[PDB]
């Protein structure tokens, strides 16, 4: 709902070339991955936003994402 579908799957397929390596995705599943991502980034941004607030900044910076992801246990 929040992202354009077309460029998103161009990313899904571009990723798909690294695995089987012959893979084709059911349309329902491409849609389910987009849904999953949108939710992930929104919630990430919610945590990012809190980090900026902690630092007395309106604006969020990659500093902020990196802190959120660290505490979330994503990338050390």
């Amino acid at each position: 709902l929040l992202i354009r579908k077309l460029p998103f799957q161009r990313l899904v397929r571009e990723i798909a070339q690294d695995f089987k390596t012959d893979l084709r995705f059911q349309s329902s599943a491409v849609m389910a991955l987009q849904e999953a991502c949108e939710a992930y980034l929104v919630g990430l941004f919610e945590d990012t936003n809190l980090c900026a607030i902690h630092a007395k900044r309106v604006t969020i910076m990659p500093k902020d994402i990196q802190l959120a992801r660290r505490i979330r246990g994503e990338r050390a």
Binding site: G43, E46, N49, I53, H54, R57, V58
Partner: protein
């Protein structure tokens, strides 16, 4: 607006309080001092000779923030009319004392010291308050916030703890403080309220439509219901939405045509 003159009396009755810092400052240094309650006003006696006066008839809200759960104890005065000291004009003047300390990387006797100062300080403050309330014939009252009704939010781009009092929604422990008089609120409207969201913004719209809306950002959903319940006990109506709305545009639209706004069904557009 010009004030009246402080009426000071020389006599047995002069409720006073020592060891008090004044926010905001008179310099880039913290001016410690003493606060004195005279006939029609408050005198603050600083060490450096700097003296600030506050009139009981200029006090809009008088807040007492105890030290429980805090590193300080506060007297807060929200003023009806901004008064000028230092460079700027200041609607908010407060007085605090610090009760707490910082360890670097089990001391027992020193903990009796702790609770006793915390007990002194807050007895000092209650006994002073009880006098001043009596000097004014209970006409000026210290509103103590209800901590059970508290919630955390980010009005100012810090995350503080906002607490209701009888007449107000309040934070007196962070500078700049946050004071909102409930009687002046038209309605509340909550934004970003939807499942899978851990945080919502709360929008405070004033009866005076010229006044820009006051935002409280990134409040935990868990607090959404407790807050609503408080809003009702205040006869403050509220509404909900997923989308963040442009309030300066909405308020512009309304103030520029206050008539036809209420021809659409008014605030019903919030549903």
């Amino acid at each position: 607006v010009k004030q009246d003159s402080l009426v000071i009396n020389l006599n047995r009755s002069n409720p006073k309080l020592k060891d008090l810092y004044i926010r905001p400052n008179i310099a880039q240094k913290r001016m410690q001092g003493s606060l004195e309650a005279h006939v029609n006003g408050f005198r603050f006696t600083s060490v450096r000779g700097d003296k600030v006066d506050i009139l009981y008839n200029n006090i809009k809200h008088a807040l007492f923030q105890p030290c429980d759960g805090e590193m300080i104890i506060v007297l807060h005065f929200h003023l009806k009319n901004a008064i000028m000291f230092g460079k700027k004009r200041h609607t908010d003047v407060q007085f605090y004392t610090e009760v707490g300390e910082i360890t670097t990387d089990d001391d027992l006797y020193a903990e009796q010291m702790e609770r006793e100062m915390r007990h002194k300080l807050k007895t000092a403050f209650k006994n002073f308050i009880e006098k001043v309330e009596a000097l004014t014939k209970e006409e000026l009252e210290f509103e103590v916030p209800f901590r059970d009704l508290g919630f955390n939010g980010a009005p100012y781009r810090s995350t503080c703890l906002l607490q209701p009092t009888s007449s107000a929604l309040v934070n007196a422990t962070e500078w700049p403080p946050f004071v909102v008089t409930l009687d002046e609120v038209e309605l509340i409207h909550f934004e970003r309220v939807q499942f899978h969201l851990k945080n919502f913004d709360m929008v405070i719209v004033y009866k005076d439509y010229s006044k820009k809306v006051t935002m409280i950002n990134a409040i935990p959903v868990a607090s959404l219901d407790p807050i609503k319940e408080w809003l009702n006990s205040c006869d403050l109506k509220y509404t909900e939405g997923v989308q963040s709305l442009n309030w300066t545009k909405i308020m512009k639209t309304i103030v520029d045509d206050p008539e036809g706004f209420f021809e659409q069904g008014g605030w019903s557009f919030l549903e």
